[PDB]
């Protein structure tokens, strides 16, 4: 959204110490965390090698929009999901199972509402 890109530019400029429109590859985790996301260090390194192809150690604003864009962006492994199906996906890795299904058979919609 326009407000989203506006606030992303607002956060980007603060890390832009010298005003060149680029931030260091070290600071990407900090700026991305400051905006509400919590990527792991492995994800941080995935970003750093995907965007910093030239190895200059800097990331400009248009790329900075790209990394988070994919960042804000499962039912089939347990599959309706019955008690027995949940029991096999459990054993692979009864009263409690009944409590599980009762609080959650579980279709896609209840499954979503409960993640």
């Amino acid at each position: 959204t326009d407000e989203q890109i506006s606030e992303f530019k607002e956060a980007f400029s603060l890390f832009d110490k010298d005003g060149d429109g680029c931030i260091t590859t070290k600071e990407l985790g900090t700026v991305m965390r400051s905006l509400g996301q919590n990527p792991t260090e492995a994800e941080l390194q995935d970003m750093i090698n995907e965007v910093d192809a030239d190895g200059n150690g800097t990331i400009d604003f248009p790329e900075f929009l790209n990394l988070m864009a994919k960042k804000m962006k499962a039912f089939r492994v347990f599959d309706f999901i019955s008690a027995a199906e949940l029991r096999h996906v459990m054993t692979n890795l009864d009263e409690e199972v009944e409590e599980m299904i009762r609080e959650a058979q579980i279709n896609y919609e209840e499954f979503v509402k409960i993640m």
Partner: peptide, 8 residues
């Protein structure tokens, strides 16, 4: 970095 994080 922490100060700027809080500032955001």
């Amino acid at each position: 970095d922490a100060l700027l994080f809080l500032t955001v």
